[PDB]
């Protein structure tokens, strides 16, 4: 009955039938994106209308369309033809992954380049990489992918160990033409393999690890109702899944006494980008938006009990659409479980004689996605004490190149002749805030140092200052770790028992933001990534920091265009967009498969409660 | 047989007898510190000599002494009388905790102040606080404690809820004189209780938490030999315990093939300080060095199975000396266990078809200490992939004051009339480095942004730069989160298979350092805390960043004096001192007992291995 329930197979089948009957899903059509729309502001009418948004690609060259469908009423609500030179191309299709390699295999320029390197075309894999927007006028309005080649010595070989440097091709995947083949010179193909399951490389496996058994003999402490509604240790929320964003959290609230208090209306990772810092023309165009260009939700892994998720695991299996509108289940795509988290609070008092210890725990909601060489785990954590935390876990295989004789300022050496270009992994979290309701504001909090002198005669005092962000034009903020800068989201109309506004404090990791020159293509297309914090006024259609159609969009879409409206954000319905990321100079230890590295953020209550919210936790 | 073994009860008894027979431990003497000395550089002689360092206090006013004893030979090696006006007072004794309250209870000025507030002297607890060095000439060379008062309504009451503001006293604990009583005015004593086990405050305890069972049916994967030598998943180390520093890690090494490779010779938390930022004369002198002034090891908790440490736990019970030289066991003072740590590495490859997942784990070595209102957990973690991490967990009860009518810029309000002054918790980690041996150097690594132009025509390139620190005078460094600054400890004479020097990278949390004015007393006494990173040349007697005798030392001891020697540190036996800390503006949620907050640092291999060191981890 909940409007936030997961999409069902029956809903997707109905969408398929509605589109087909309306003449919008002929043989030349492909669904590039399909997702349920959230209820509009003011769902207190019980008049449920399950609407779906669809992007429809046409493989024959016709204009793509954006379509909204009501499954509740069985109708097409709107259908708009898209001018992609203007508003951007549609996301990459899974079925285009193979097309780049296949088109290149019959191109005489490509075959000539492989012949000079004595490479068998049957052994050459081509990565299907998004194109961006650069100097090539013929690409405007065309659906382009760029290809970089890797050799597989045999079908089970890791091709990433054998990059073919000095060679790149550009392909129009609709007209099926190779537009350019660029060969800047022959590099030796690195010869060592990177097969991390080969006994010759691993050596004998360890026999020293003894098992760790994690069980819950009375079952878990959380309940799941309505398919995706979670209740756990005073938390309440709905777990959504979208093919673009992946796991989405709705209606995060905390039961404080007899009151259900909202905190976050919607939380998601709304974009991520991996810009490369190698100036070689073979790779200097390389920036992929895994979320906006490739759709991370459609590549979610099926997670194995005991290997991927350990303990008493509750799975969700979300349903998505394939390219033809058929429902497809991602079996065991989302893991949910609680974890012990050490000491929560402890004190032994010298005067009262009372010894007190309590243990902490967290609820974990996670999925894992794989897009080419990279694999990411997305983890949301809820803690007993009101803390909310996000963590991204990056692993997989680093993207490789040749390592030039004589070295490089922009590439790390991993093995003889094998390089890994410098790059970043930058995420955008979109937090549609609802601290005790929708009237919220953001304050920037800095530590204040004080000079020794009158009123501070011993020079020990220090303080803090809070600056309210009142309009969108002043709500683009940078980190300052040295001044301990944080941001507080508060509700000026909801006070705690001390008559102070209730709030939550955002703690960033203060990692570097986008390093590219501000005049670069990527700085214009990923403008969100140049600043740590943005605050906008809520609007239905302002969903992604990069805009709706990221692929081959010329720039400036999304957050820079939204904030130009300069709307009032002082005690209003607001959205916080937090940029955070890893800067990766690859190390030898990252090869041939990378141990996990992590980045994230957290939010902690700041006078939201009238005292510690975990006084009623029992003594185990 | 190992020279790094824990002190035994028999060793401490022998020290007691040696001191007694030498005439150094009469009835007026108290042992303020006793600890084993590490072997000198060049222990490859097998000529073991277990030596102990002792600080001896005299309650009758005689000069204290520093004494070194050889238990192996049964002799006093050296005994030096200390001039405490020059070199500092000895650490606070546990038996002095009671003396401040007892002396004040018979002082007419103190009783007059309590009478005006209608407080029963029998209900008034006095915190025994270290004095520092300020404007009071009569304190030089005298052993002073300062007292702040708190009311206990009944024996099991939390006195921290009832601070008596506006009142402070100074006491000479040797002459047993109250030197000053300062009363700046009457503040209401906050009336609400803070009893976190009272059902009226907790409400009904939760019944919703279901058990989490963590067991190891085949036992743990680590072995303990010789009492304190650990071997775990290619790691090797010795777990030490010192009454001042607490848990100390010796001889951290990693078994890489058939080679045992050193990484860290000695790791410890060598000082910690809590400076307060309230300019009221009642508290503006308040800065306690829990390690250097109070000795955190002697207040280690006995840790309970299932509550403090959960899983298959191996305990160590270190032995320390009491004030009379009797051995005292801290039963179950150190917990050791391994923990599952999620995904280690994962990839599903689109071209090879191979799906690969491995799980991570960490070895945990921890203890918990309690000094007055504060409780801290110290955690050392070793990971499968070569990462070493330290984490401090801060909990307990915040130090309180009145909350002034009309507010404060330096105090948070926690309850009606109840304040908590702003403060920091700042730690110093001393890392006696031994990356593949003792010839090490430190490089500072910054991200380098590049301008769009020739050789970077698309404005995407970025790089890194490394600066070698060659002499101690240039080895005092600050964090720079915006440039991604890290520090690499490498061995220039030990190369990996790519002919690059092996190394480890230190990742800081980049939290603010000491906020006090640089002309303040605390800035001079805690100079280490003003900078994020110091590198010194190893020397036997350079043990603590604050010097040997921190209590009432006038300033400049420790690191500022060491680095003035300007020694060569480029490929030498070096020590890294890392400052890290929390800046605490207390929140309502911290009251009446604070949920854990954390801070720390980690070190990750940086070309130390020839490839990922966890290829031989099996598939669970
Ligand atoms: O992560 C998206 C870029 C990509 C896609 C497919 C193969 C390699 C790299
Ligand atoms: O943490 C050392 C300062 C202290 C000691 C005893 C009681 C309260 C505070
Ligand atoms: Cu990376
Ligand atoms: Cu604190
Ligand atoms: Na355009
Ligand atoms: Na909002
Ligand atoms: Na002095
Ligand atoms: Na060293």
The DSSP result for B584-617, as a single string, is: E---GGG-SSEEEEEEEEEEEESS-SSS-TTTT-
Question: Which residues, 6 or more positions from A374, have their beta carbon under 8 angstroms from its beta carbon?
Answer: A274, A290, A394, A396, A397, A399
CATH 2.40.50.100 matches A196-619? no
Sheet containing A51-58: order of strands: A29-36, A51-58, A65-70, A75-81
Name which CATH class applies to A94-195.
alpha beta
Question: Which residues, 6 or more positions from B240, have their beta carbon under 8 angstroms from its beta carbon?
Answer: B4, B6, B228, B247, B248, B249, B250
Annotated catalytic residue, options A374, A379, A538, A544: A374
Cβ–Cβ < 8 Å for A433, A608: no
Is A255's Cβ below 8 Å from some Cβ in B?
no
With 0-12 / 13-18 / 19 or more C-beta atoms within 10 angstroms meaning exposed / middle / buried, residue A46 is exposed
Ligand 2 pocket, mutate which of B374, B396, B397, B584 (most atoms under 8 A from CB): B374
Q: Which of A274, A266, A272 is nearest to A546 (CA)?
A: A272
Question: Which residues, 6 or more positions from B42, have their beta carbon under 8 angstroms from its beta carbon?
Answer: none
Atom of ligand 2 nearest to the CA of B293: 2
- CA–CA separation, A88 vs B540, rounded Å? 67
- CA–CA separation, B58 vs B40, rounded Å? 30
Q: Which of A241, A254, A430 is nearest to A335 (CA)?
A: A241
Q: Which residues of B touch A422 (CB under 8 A)?
A: 462-464
- Establish whether A381 is a catalytic residue: no
- CA–CA separation, A299 vs A293, rounded Å? 13
**What is the number of other CB atoms lying within 10 angstroms of the CB of residue B8?**
15
Three-state secondary-structure class, residue B356:
strand
Three-state secondary-structure class, residue A89:
coil
Question: Which residues, 6 or more positions from A99, have their beta carbon under 8 angstroms from its beta carbon?
Answer: A128, A145, A171, A173, A176
Task: Please check if A219 is assigned to a binding site.
Answer: no
Is A134's Cβ below 8 Å from some Cβ in B?
yes
**Would you say the CB of residue B380 lies under 6 angstroms from ligand 2?**
no
Cβ–Cβ < 8 Å for B336, B316: yes
- Establish whether A374 is a catalytic residue: yes
The alpha carbon of A92 and the centre of ligand 5 are apart by a number of angstroms equal to 18
- CA–CA separation, B66 vs B35, rounded Å? 12
At which residue do the structure tokens 């007190």 appear?
A356
How many Å is the Cα radius of gyration of chain A? 26
At which residue do the structure tokens 């964003």 appear?
A245
- CA–CA separation, B148 vs B155, rounded Å? 19
Which of the 8 DSSP states describes residue B63?
P
Of A134, A587, A596, the CB nearest to B344: A596
User: Strand B229-232 vs strand A65-70: parallel, antiparallel, or unpaired?
Assistant: unpaired
Angle at the Cα of A343 from the Cα atoms of A341 and A344, rounded to 5 degrees:
90
- CA–CA separation, A584 vs A448, rounded Å? 33
Contact assignment for B611 to A605 by CB distance below 8 Å: no
- CA–CA separation, B140 vs B553, rounded Å? 9
Which residue in A has a C-alpha nearest to residue B150's C-alpha?
Answer: A351
- CA–CA separation, B127 vs B119, rounded Å? 16
Cβ–Cβ < 8 Å for A412, A390: no
- CA–CA separation, A461 vs A452, rounded Å? 8
Which residue in B has a C-alpha nearest to residue A383's C-alpha?
Answer: B595
Distance from chain centroid for Cα A255: 29
Question: Which residues, 6 or more positions from A394, have their beta carbon under 8 angstroms from its beta carbon?
Answer: A374, A375, A376, A425, A582, A594, A596, A597, A598, A599
Three-state secondary-structure class, residue A73:
coil
Euclidean distance between the first and the last CA atom of chain A, given in angstroms as a whole number = 37
How many Å is the Cα radius of gyration of chain B? 26
CATH topology assigned to domain A1-87: Nuclear Transport Factor 2; Chain: A, (3.10.450)
- CA–CA separation, A69 vs B432, rounded Å? 66
Give the best residue of B349, B389, B405, B479 to mutate against chain A (max A CB count within 10 A): B349
- CA–CA separation, A206 vs B221, rounded Å? 11
Distance from chain centroid for Cα B257: 34
- CA–CA separation, B148 vs A481, rounded Å? 34
Question: Which residues, 6 or more positions from A462, have their beta carbon under 8 angstroms from its beta carbon?
Answer: A447, A448, A449, A450, B277, B410, B422, B515, B516
- CA–CA separation, A213 vs A468, rounded Å? 49
Which of the 8 DSSP states describes residue B19?
H
At which residue do the structure tokens 């935390």 appear?
A389
- CA A143 to chain B, closest CA, distance in angstroms equals 21
What's the half-sphere exposure (Cβ side, CA atoms, 13 Å) at A138? 9
Three-state secondary-structure class, residue A103:
helix
Of B354, B375, B395, the CB nearest to A156: B354
Q: Which of B84, B167, B87 is nearest to B124 (CA)?
A: B167
Give the H or E element holding residue B13. helix B9-21
Q: CATH 3.10.450.40 occupies which residues in chain B?
A: 1-87, 94-195
The alpha carbon of B265 and the centre of ligand 8 are apart by a number of angstroms equal to 7
What are the Cα distances from residue B318, in Å, to A297, B12, B19, B72?
52, 12, 22, 20
Contacts 24+ apart (CB under 8 A), A183-188: A183/A109, A183/A113, A184/A280, A184/A281, A184/A282, A186/A116, A186/A117, A187/A402, A187/A404, A188/A402, A188/A417
Strand runs labelled E in B173-282:
177-183, 213-215, 223-225, 229-232, 235-242, 246-256, 259-275
- Phi, psi values for residue B159, rounded to 5°: -70, -25
- CA–CA separation, B262 vs B433, rounded Å? 9
Cβ–Cβ < 8 Å for A254, A233: no
Q: Which of A293, A372, A380, A289 is nearest to A334 (CA)?
A: A380
Burial per residue of A228-241, b for 16 or more beta-carbon CB atoms within 10 angstroms, e otherwise: bbbebbbbbbbbbb
- CA A570 to chain B, closest CA, distance in angstroms equals 23
Give the H or E element holding residue A115. helix A108-116
User: Strand A355-371 vs strand A374-383: parallel, antiparallel, or unpaired?
Assistant: antiparallel
With 0-12 / 13-18 / 19 or more C-beta atoms within 10 angstroms meaning exposed / middle / buried, residue A287 is buried
What's the half-sphere exposure (Cβ side, CA atoms, 13 Å) at B589? 22
Angle at the Cα of A309 from the Cα atoms of A252 and A226, rounded to 5 degrees:
40
Cβ–Cβ < 8 Å for A7, A36: yes
What is the four-CA torsion angle of A153, A157, A162, A167, rounded to 10 degrees? Answer: 70
Q: Which of A462, A473, A503 is nearest to A486 (CA)?
A: A503
- CA–CA separation, A353 vs A356, rounded Å? 10
Query: Can you say which residues of B are annotated as belonging to the binding site for substrate?
Result: 288-299, 371-376
What are the Cα distances from residue B76, in Å, to A543, B26, B38, B66, B548?
76, 16, 17, 11, 20
Euclidean distance between the first and the last CA atom of chain B, given in angstroms as a whole number = 37
Torsion-angle region of B495 (φ positive above 0: left; ψ -120 to 50: alpha; else: beta): beta
Three-state secondary-structure class, residue A599:
strand
- Phi, psi values for residue A186, rounded to 5°: -85, 125
Three-state secondary-structure class, residue A314:
strand
Annotated catalytic residue, options A290, A432, A548, A590: A290
Which residue in A has a C-alpha nearest to residue B620's C-alpha?
Answer: A307
- Phi, psi values for residue A591, rounded to 5°: -115, 140
Is B200's Cβ below 8 Å from some Cβ in A?
no
- CA–CA separation, A367 vs A333, rounded Å? 6
Q: In chain A, how long is the greatest CA-to-CA distance?
A: 87
Burial per residue of B93-131, b for 16 or more beta-carbon CB atoms within 10 angstroms, e otherwise: bbebbebbbebbeeeeebeebbeebebeeebbbbbbbbb
Burial per residue of B256-290, b for 16 or more beta-carbon CB atoms within 10 angstroms, e otherwise: eeeeebbbbbbbbbbbbbbbbbbbbebbbbbbbbb
Burial per residue of B528-554, b for 16 or more beta-carbon CB atoms within 10 angstroms, e otherwise: bbbbbbbbbbbeeebbbbbbbbbbbbe
* Final resolution, Å: 1.7
**Would you say the CB of residue A562 lies under 6 angstroms from ligand 1?**
no
- Phi, psi values for residue B366, rounded to 5°: -145, 155
Cβ–Cβ < 8 Å for B311, B216: yes
Residue identifier of the C-alpha nearest atom 5 of ligand 1: A372
- CA–CA separation, B361 vs B381, rounded Å? 10
Cβ–Cβ < 8 Å for A417, A405: no
Cβ–Cβ < 8 Å for A259, A379: no
Strand runs labelled E in A112-258:
124-130, 144-151, 167-172, 177-183, 213-215, 223-225, 229-232, 235-242, 246-256
- CA–CA separation, A550 vs A540, rounded Å? 18
**What is the number of other CB atoms lying within 10 angstroms of the CB of residue A167?**
24
- Determination approach: X-ray
- CA–CA separation, A389 vs A600, rounded Å? 7
- CA–CA separation, B562 vs B439, rounded Å? 20
Q: B197 pairs with which residues across the strands?
A: none
Angle at the Cα of B550 from the Cα atoms of B544 and B552, rounded to 5 degrees:
165
Cβ–Cβ < 8 Å for A206, B616: yes
Gaps in chain A with C–N over 2.5 Å, residue before each: none
Give the H or E element holding residue A202. helix A199-202
Give the pair of three-digit tokens for residue B524.
Answer: 């001079």
Angle at the Cα of B291 from the Cα atoms of B286 and B296, rounded to 5 degrees:
115
- Cis peptide, bond prior to residue A211, ω within 30 of zero: no
Give the H or E element holding residue A15. helix A9-21
- CA–CA separation, A45 vs A356, rounded Å? 48
Question: Which residues, 6 or more positions from B322, have their beta carbon under 8 angstroms from its beta carbon?
Answer: B31, B328
Question: Which residues, 6 or more positions from B416, have their beta carbon under 8 angstroms from its beta carbon?
Answer: A498, B190, B191, B192
Which sign does the torsion angle of CA B90, B95, B100, B102 carry?
Answer: negative
Distance from chain centroid for Cα A573: 23
With 0-12 / 13-18 / 19 or more C-beta atoms within 10 angstroms meaning exposed / middle / buried, residue B199 is exposed
Question: Which residues, 6 or more positions from A306, have their beta carbon under 8 angstroms from its beta carbon?
Answer: B620
- CA–CA separation, A497 vs B128, rounded Å? 33
Q: CATH 2.70.98.20 occupies which residues in chain B?
A: 196-619
């Amino acid at each position: 009955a909940s409007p936030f329930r997961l999409a069902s197979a029956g809903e997707i089948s109905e969408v398929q039938g509605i589109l087909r009957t309306a003449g919008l899903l002929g043989p030349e059509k492909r669904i590039a994106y399909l997702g349920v729309l959230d209820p509009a502001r003011g769902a207190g009418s019980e008049a449920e209308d399950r609407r779906f948004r669809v992007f429809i690609h046409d493989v024959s060259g016709a204009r793509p369309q954006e379509v909204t469908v009501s499954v509740t009423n069985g109708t097409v609500i709107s259908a708009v033809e898209l001018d992609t030179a203007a508003t951007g191309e549609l996301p990459v299709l899974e079925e285009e992954f193979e097309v780049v390699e296949q088109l290149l295999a019959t191109d005489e320029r490509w075959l000539k380049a492989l012949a000079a390197r004595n490479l068998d075309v049957s052994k050459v894999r081509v990565a299907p990489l998004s194109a961006g927007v650069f100097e090539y006028a013929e690409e405007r309005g065309r659906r382009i992918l760029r290809g970089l080649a890797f050799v597989q010595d045999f079908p089970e070989d890791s091709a990433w160990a054998h990059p073919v440097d000095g060679l790149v091709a550009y392909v129009d995947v609709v007209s099926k033409e190779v537009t350019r083949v660029i060969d800047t010179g022959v590099f030796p193909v690195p010869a060592e393999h990177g097969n991390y399951t080969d006994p010759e490389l691993t050596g004998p496996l360890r026999t020293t690890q003894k098992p760790i058994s994690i069980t819950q003999p009375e079952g878990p402490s959380f309940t799941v109702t309505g398919g995706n509604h979670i209740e756990w240790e005073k938390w309440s929320l709905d777990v959504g899944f979208d093919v673009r964003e992946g796991v989405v959290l709705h209606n995060i609230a905390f039961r404080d006494g007899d009151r259900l208090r909202p905190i976050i209306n919607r939380a998601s990772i709304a974009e991520m980008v991996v810009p490369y810092g190698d100036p070689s023309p073979i790779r200097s165009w390389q920036n992929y938006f895994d979320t906006g260009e490739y759709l991370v939700g459609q590549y979610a892994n099926s997670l194995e009990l005991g290997c991927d998720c350990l303990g008493d695991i509750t799975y969700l299996s979300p349903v998505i659409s394939d390219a033809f509108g058929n429902p497809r289940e991602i079996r065991n795509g989302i893991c949910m479980h609680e974890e012990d988290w050490g000491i929560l609070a402890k004190h032994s008092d010298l005067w009262s004689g009372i010894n007190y210890t309590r243990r902490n725990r967290r609820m974990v909601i996670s999925f894992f996605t794989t897009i080419g060489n990279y694999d990411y785990g997305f983890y949301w954590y809820l803690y007993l004490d009101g803390t909310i935390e996000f963590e991204a876990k990056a692993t997989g295989v680093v993207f490789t190149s040749a390592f030039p004789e004589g070295g490089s300022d922009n590439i790390s050496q991993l093995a003889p002749g094998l390089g890994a270009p410098f790059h970043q992994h930058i995420f955008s979290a979109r937090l549609d805030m609802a601290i005790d309701g929708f009237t919220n504001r953001v304050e920037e909090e800095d530590v204040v140092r004080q000079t020794m002198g009158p009123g501070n005669e011993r020079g020990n005092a220090f303080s803090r200052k809070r600056t309210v962000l009142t309009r969108e034009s002043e709500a683009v903020r940078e980190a300052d770790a040295r001044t301990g800068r944080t941001w507080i989201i508060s509700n000026p109309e909801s006070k705690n028992r001390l008559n102070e506004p209730v709030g939550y404090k955002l703690h960033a990791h203060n990692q570097p933001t986008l390093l590219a020159d501000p005049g670069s293509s990527i700085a214009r297309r990923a403008a969100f990534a140049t600043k740590d914090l943005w605050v906008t006024r809520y609007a239905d259609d302002e969903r992604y920091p990069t805009g709706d159609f990221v692929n081959q969009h010329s720039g400036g879409a999304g957050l820079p265009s939204y904030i130009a409206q300069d709307r009032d954000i002082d005690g209003q319905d607001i959205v916080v967009w937090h940029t955070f990321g890893l800067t990766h100079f690859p190390r030898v230890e990252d090869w041939p498969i990378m141990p996990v590295d992590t980045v994230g953020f957290k939010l902690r209550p700041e006078g939201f409660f009238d005292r510690s919210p975990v006084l009623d936790v029992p003594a185990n």
